[PDB]
Amino acid sequence: PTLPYYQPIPGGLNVGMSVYIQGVASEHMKRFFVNFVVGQDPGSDVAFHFNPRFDGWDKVVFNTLQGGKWGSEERKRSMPFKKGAAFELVFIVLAEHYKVVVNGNPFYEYGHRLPLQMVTHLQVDGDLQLQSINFIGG
């Protein structure tokens, strides 16, 4: 797949589903993001925004965009990615939260703010190369 990636999730998002992303973080990475998006119209809500950042104290930001407004940011001050390194990024969709697993290590649990069944698309962009995106357990 090529970037930017913005594709429908087959059968929409459901509990039990996993999203498995294999990529390589850019040698020159500042940020990238993975968005679980409600539709493909301009100004679509983002149920879940997953945003690793190397600017400043290395961290990952988690948020929701609803009605044009970013919510209260959640943050984990730990960077499971590495500039120039291949990664395995898994989102396990559970009833209570998205469980994020990076290179086999449980990383974060992001509680649902928008109903997960409203999600139609996965969007991925930023400072990385994409090797594959797979939807499992749909």
11 with 136: CB under 8 angstroms? no
| Look-up of token digits 């990238």 | 32
* 1-138 CATH, one of 3.10.560.10, 3.30.565.60, 2.60.120.200, 3.20.20.10: 2.60.120.200
d(CA 26, CA 74): 24
Where b means 16+ CB within 10 Å and e means fewer, 59-94 reads: ebbbbbbeeeeeeeeeeeeebbbeeeeebebbbbbe
Method used experimentally? X-ray
The distance in angstroms from the start CA to the end CA of the chain is 20
Residue ranges of the domains in the chain?
1-138
In SS3 terms, the chain reads as CCCCEEEECCCCCCCCCEEEEEEEECCCCCEEEEEEEECCCCCCEEEEEEEEECCCCCEEEEEEEECCEECCCEEECCCCCCCCCEEEEEEEECCCEEEEEECCEEEEEEECCCCHHHCCEEEEEECEEEEEEEEECC
Question: What resolution (Å)?
Answer: 2.0
